[model samples]
Target chain A: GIQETDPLTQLSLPPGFRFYPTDEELMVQYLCRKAAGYDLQLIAEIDLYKFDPWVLPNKALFGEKEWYFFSPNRVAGSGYWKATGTDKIISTEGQRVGIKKALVFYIGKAPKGTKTNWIMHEYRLIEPDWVLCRIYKKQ
Target chain B: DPLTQLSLPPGFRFYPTDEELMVQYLCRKAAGFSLQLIAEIDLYKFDPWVLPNKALFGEKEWYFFSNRVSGYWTDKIISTEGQRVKKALVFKTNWIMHEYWVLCRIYKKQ
Candidate 1:
């Protein structure tokens, strides 16, 4: 009884509609398109490092639990994003497409910062200085 | 907002949380508001593999209108906005069903 067209922003969709992209999808579809200078009006372009994690949802293209953005990239507020793990290679059809890194937001100065539940998956195309990120909080 | 918005992005999916199902879909649906995203189906009459074809949205896990009041459905009652939401596993497998006041979310875990 529902029209399966577009327009899933906010109330336009049912409650659970989300922008949850897979690593491969982000690599080939979004990051690749973005690095090549094509406009993917779907993901919001922002200076995400300038704002805190809590202030990001409103700045995203669309999401609830996790938010996605094509930011110039980095940290915000009293906390900063610090890399916590090894970088993962995003591959499609057996070819390396992008590099994925996990980061934890820290609440203090470097080397002495406190860890928070905030997490970010930084996706970098094998081509450019630009980055696409997915930010979310851990329960 | 000058970015020429389209429907949703390419890889977006319908992955609603427990609270979202209660407040946005069930709460509104119970109060007479029509949400076009979820479909109506008698979840008990069909097998889990046969439900996705009847869902309005979803890839692996699907949602549907339930026959709860009229219904094996073990439930854990949780309160959301003063309303009791019953969440359960349909006979305990990858099949998860979340029952609110009216609707049921039926899904298969892959």
Candidate 2:
């Protein structure tokens, strides 16, 4: 359950405010600033692939249904995340700013892994190894 | 809504909770103080597909001041804090609208 004293709630933001950034915002505002090594303490930097999707909510800086993280490509949890679908281009106006790849967490082996509702969208600067990801569970 | 993005930092949006919709937006609207965050419309007059363009601010979901509209009951009411939050399907479409007094939040289930 979310508590009122949580850091996000403590931000004292106006009523109804939330953290729901679009792909373009993630690329232009978050990833671009982060890649430049500017101090962006908003999204947490964690090797999130090390943990399963079920445990990810607690690891996030702030979120309820959806969570974001600055993670690298690696895994050692009970299930592995497998890439799915084609890459999506994140464009602002007419400029191609970033790329988004969809991945699903699967339980069991690679060749025959059981698909789960846990989904992750890895957003990267078109120009890294340090990709920004949005994690969520589909209904 | 697009220009507001320039002033706001990353990860900030109009994704209000049910309680916030009731207390902040709806209550304020009822008092004749418009937040200008949600558009006022006769909801049933338009289909859900056309709402995204009509909305004041939204991405996946849209918010509007329906002034109160009723429809098919596909889902049960959700209680936010203590305020009543009503949920109903828009005619035969997958679009669902969660209502709180005169305000409504509309979205389609994928």
Candidate 3:
């Protein structure tokens, strides 16, 4: 049954097998649309905060080491999603474009918690609190 | 713990365009406010780079929580240019009485 819908062969990717969208593209093209309540292809909106990092792939429509989703305004888990890395901005020819916030999933309470391998990049929306989340593992 | 995740990293900043400033921050400040969310800085007092220097960040554009002309924006006090391309969207729901912005872009100088 699952073989009938294998995406690897059916999808039309670009020339390179690699998929890399700059911080701006990720927010403008994907994140912004999903947050605005538009149903998008490939990436489906889910209650990501409801599940743990280890079990995310099973919940996604497609993804390998990285999973993308339009999450409701919520926390990572019972554990907090602590921001570790600096907030990086992606600009286009000196104009403001998008924001990238790096965060970590902690296993316990904040300020005195244990860090997990789960890392997240929350792309900021131009308005409200809608955030496009990218959850992935750290090596 | 979950709340901790919302924290931004070092040197992190929230950059908003002029339209977003008028709609989100400026409007919100006019109704009810938070200096912490968007601090008020004398626009004329500081240069573009001054914001990033005095505030939590220092890069491209910075966020300021205040602006002028009450009905001016809504009343059309100043001239606008080009088609308004919305950069942000607002959605607000109050307990019983709250306006949810589900709302624009305009700004320029000769």
Candidate 4:
């Protein structure tokens, strides 16, 4: 087992919220049930990248002038969301934005050296409550 | 309640409230790394698969992702069986759909 970080240990969600389960557990129960309803993969890898190097100032929001690194388009395949939620995360800047909890889909492995190991990066929250419904296959 | 506070691991200090943790501590941490300084954002909605879409709208969505990416890298300091480099690996892409959402899913055989 890995050394537990205090953040992980002390981490607690507000009432009515609970920590997500491991991939194995999620697959066996929730993911499997959702798969029957939606056209998507059961499991996949995900990576997260930041645009600017430094954090923004208090009360400031990230502008639209940052560079990003992602996989190629042709390499990406059909995908969709499973279960999702929204959380109002508080930033150091005193700004609050709605984030979505999303289970995205993919076909293959992520690029080497990518931040796929971090479980937190896998699930994404787009809008407050909006999750990507589905990704159409390339015709 | 007191036991919970005392039970905290060494070097771990309680902020006494979420506001303190979010504003005083978390804010400093985000600023130290030059990450976005917003108080709250829905992390779950930030897409990793769309990192390759660099169009006008794609760029905007990427900004949100970049601002919130923060974590510690201990691969070099810690000796573990499966340790790798300890760097914050940030995804850079435009299209949310173009990028893979799950890391394991990326290398899966087609």
lDDT (10s digit) by residue, model 1, range A14-117? 34656667888888888877777786367888887887778888877566678888877244787788887799987787564788989888886777678888
DockQ of predictions, in order shown? 0.42, 0.47, 0.01, 0.02
The order of the candidates by DockQ, greatest first, is: 2, 1, 4, 3
Looking at candidate 1 chain A, the ten consecutive residues that score lowest on lDDT are: A6-15
Per-residue alpha-carbon lDDT of model 2 for B31-86, expressed as tens digits?
A: 54423667778877775678888887677888788733434335456567775644
lDDT score for candidate 1 against the true structure = 0.71
What is the full ranking by lDDT, best candidate first?
2, 1, 3, 4
Model 2 misplaced regions, further than 4 Å? A1-9, A93-96, B1-8, B17-19, B27-101, B104-110
Query: How accurately is candidate 2 docked according to DockQ?
Result: 0.47
lDDT (tens digit, per residue) of candidate 4 on A16-94: 1122333333332333333334421222212222211122111121112221111111122222222224433312222
Expressed as tens digits, the lDDT of each residue in B41-88 for candidate 3 is 553354332344554332333344322221112223221254342232
Model 3, C-alpha of B73: deviation from truth (Å): 62
Better of 1 and 3 by DockQ: 1
Chain A TM-scores of each predicted structure, in the order given, are 0.80, 0.84, 0.75, 0.20
CA lDDT of B68 in candidate 2? 31
Top candidate by TM-score: 1
Candidate 1: regions farther than 4 A off: A1-11, A47-66, A73-80, A94-96, A107-109, A114-117, B1-6, B30-35, B67-74, B82-85, B91-93
Give candidate 3's error at residue B19 in angstroms. Answer: 48
TM-score, cand. 1: 0.71
